[PDB]
Each structure stands twice: as C-alpha cells, then as structure tokens.
Amino acid sequence: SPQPLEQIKLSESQLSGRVGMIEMDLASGRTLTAWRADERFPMMSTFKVVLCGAVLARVDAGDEQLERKIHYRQQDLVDYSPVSEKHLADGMTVGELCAAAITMSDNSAANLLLATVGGPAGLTAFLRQIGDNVTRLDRWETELNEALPGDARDTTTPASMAATLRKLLTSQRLSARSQRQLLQWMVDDRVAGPLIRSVLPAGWFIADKTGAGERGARGIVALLGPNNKAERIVVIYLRDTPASMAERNQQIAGIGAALIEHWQR
Numbered sequence: 001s002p003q004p005l006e007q008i009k010l011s012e013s014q015l016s017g018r019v020g021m022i023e024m025d026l027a028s029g030r031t032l033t034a035w036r037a038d039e040r041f042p043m044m045s046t047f048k049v050v051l052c053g054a055v056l057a058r059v060d061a062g063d064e065q066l067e068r069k070i071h072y073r074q075q076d077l078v079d080y081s082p083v084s085e086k087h088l089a090d091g092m093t094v095g096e097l098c099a100a101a102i103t104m105s106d107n108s109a110a111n112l113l114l115a116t117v118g119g120p121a122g123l124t125a126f127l128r129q130i131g132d133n134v135t136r137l138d139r140w141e142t143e144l145n146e147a148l149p150g151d152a153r154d155t156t157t158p159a160s161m162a163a164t165l166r167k168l169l170t171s172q173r174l175s176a177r178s179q180r181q182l183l184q185w186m187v188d189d190r191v192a193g194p195l196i197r198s199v200l201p202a203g204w205f206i207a208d209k210t211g212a213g214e215r216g217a218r219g220i221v222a223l224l225g226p227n228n229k230a231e232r233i234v235v236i237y238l239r240d241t242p243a244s245m246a247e248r249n250q251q252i253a254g255i256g257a258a259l260i261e262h263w264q265r
C-alpha cells in the first residue's frame with residue numbers, strides 16, 4: 001500500500017470526490033494524519049454517537065435514566081426502524097434506544113433520543129458545552145442525510161468529530177460507567193463491525209459507527225489498533241462523488257490498509 005496520505009489522495013483521484021480524514025491517538029489526542037481536517041462534511045448517521053454522548057451526560061447529571069421506558073406510536077416512526085418498529089406496544093428504554101441507534105442505525109430510535117436532549121438545537125448546545133464549536137445538527141432523521149452542495153447544516157469536520165469522540169470516551173466529562181457504555185455500543189455495531197472484522201488481520205481491534213448520504217456521502221468514525229487495543233481514533237468522510245457504494249467502501253478500506261501497513265508513525 002502507499003503511505004496513508006498518498007492513499008487518501010489516490011482515493012480522491014479515483015472517486016472524483018472530497019475525502020476528509022483524521023488519525024488521532026485515543027489516549028493523548030496526538031494527530032498523526034490530517035487531510036482536509038477543517039473542511040465540512042455531512043455527519044449522516046455518525047451523529048448517533050454524539051447523540052448518545054448527550055444522553056449519557058444527562059444520565060450522569062441525574063436528569064435521565066437508561067432504564068426509563070419511552071412509549072411511542074406508529075405515526076412517529078421514520079424510514080428504517082428495524083428495532084423500534086417491533087416495540088410499539090411495549091416501548092423501549094432510553095438505553096435500548098441508544099443501542100438501536102448506534103448498533104443498528106435505527107432512525108426512529110435516534111429521533112426519540114433527539115427529543116430527550118432538546119432536538120437538534122439541544123444537541124448542538126451540548127456540543128458547544130463540551131467545546132466543539134464547529135459540529136452542528138439542524139435536522140431530524142432522515143432529512144439530515146441530504147448532503148446538498150454548499151450546505152452547512154448537519155455537518156462536522158474530521159478534526160472536530162475526532163476531538164469530540166475523544167472527549168466523550170476519555171475526558172471524564174462522562175462518568176466512568178457512561179464512558180464504558182458509549183464504547184461498548186460502538187463495539188457492538190452490527191452494520192459494519194462484523195464486515196470490518198472479516199477483512200482485518202488477526203489482532204486488530206475495531207469499534208465504529210458508519211453513515212451514508214446523497215451525492216456519494218459516506219463516513220466512518222472508528223477506534224482501531226493492534227494488539228486488541230483501541231489505540232487510535234480514525235474519522236473518514238467522503239462527499240460529492242458519483243461512485244457506487246461498493247467503490248466508496250473499497251476506498252475507505254484501502255485507506256484502512258495503508259494505515260495498518262504503515263502503523264508506526
């Protein structure tokens with residue numbers, strides 16, 4: 001494989017799109033690789049990790065319980081509700097909703113959770129309170145995936161998303177049990193976790209959340225490392241490419257291969 005930066009460039013040339021990426025040490029925040037790291041990209045479903053960070057902050061403050069059952073109605077459901085559509089009668093706990101949102105990308109679950117944290121404006125205010133001055137959520141599922149050219153709504157930057165994830169997972173803004181919970185939900189991702197493990201060498205850790213949107217938008221927020229350890233945060237976003245989903249996936253995998261082959265930098 002080429003060096004990671006060279007492989008990112010090659011992926012732009014091949015996709016005829018913009019790629020944004022950060023590779024960051026989880027423990028220290030050292031940035032090892034930046035590429036378009038201050039440019040804006042649609043978050044798509046990757047926002048669900050930050051959402052459940054906000055939920056966990058309310059639990060730590062005594063303002064929420066993961067056990068609290070939320071009842072909802074069929075009229076409330078949006079497209080792709082694989083878990084939530086099964087619990088119209090019996091409801092779901094706040095923690096079950098976060099599991100569904102992060103591990104299955106259940107969109108109704110995400111919207112029910114958004115309603116608990118004050119909507120998109122509430123989530124954006126949470127971000128500002130933990131010192132993320134860039135990321136913004138403006139819409140609900142599924143309209144937030146629209147990825148219009150030039151539109152700043154529902155965007156992050158690779159650098160801001162990585163810093164925000166590190167804050168949630170490691171900075172003691174969240175309680176110890178809450179940090180462990182957030183991590184475990186990412187470990188349990190069903191959408192891409194197993195697929196990623198199928199192509200990772202033995203010994204590599206993965207935890208992740210993925211997203212997709214219009215005009216080729218694609219993204220992943222991940223924890224990765226050798227020796228079965230979550231050593232680095234890797235954030236990769238793609239936008240404005242006509243490529244097939246399979247080719248976008250293959251280019252992100254190729255960046256992954258470059259990082260693995262050149263890990264000690």
Ligand SMILES: OC[C@H]1O[C@H](O[C@H]2[C@H](O)[C@@H](O)[C@H](OCCCCCCC3CCCCC3)O[C@@H]2CO)[C@H](O)[C@@H](O)[C@@H]1O
Pocket residue numbers: 001196199200201202206220221222223224234235236252253254256257258260261
């Ligand atoms: O010498 C290093 C390794 O080189 C190869 O591993 C290959 C592997 O066979 C391939 O499947 C993967 O593709 C890349 C898989 C990565 C999937 C994307 C993951 C990313 C996306 C961004 C967020 C973090 C995770 O590349 C590695 C590195 O060449 C050998 O198969 C393996 O025995 C050896 O230990």
Ligand SMILES: *C(=O)C1=CN=C(C(=O)O)CS[C@H]1c1cn2c(n1)COCC2
Pocket residue numbers: 043044045046080104105107141142145191210211212213214
């Ligand atoms: C999250 O990224 C996300 C993106 N895109 C759409 C869409 O393209 O219509 C809908 S919401 C949400 C989503 C939908 N699914 C997943 N994530 C996971 O795969 C199954 C369907």
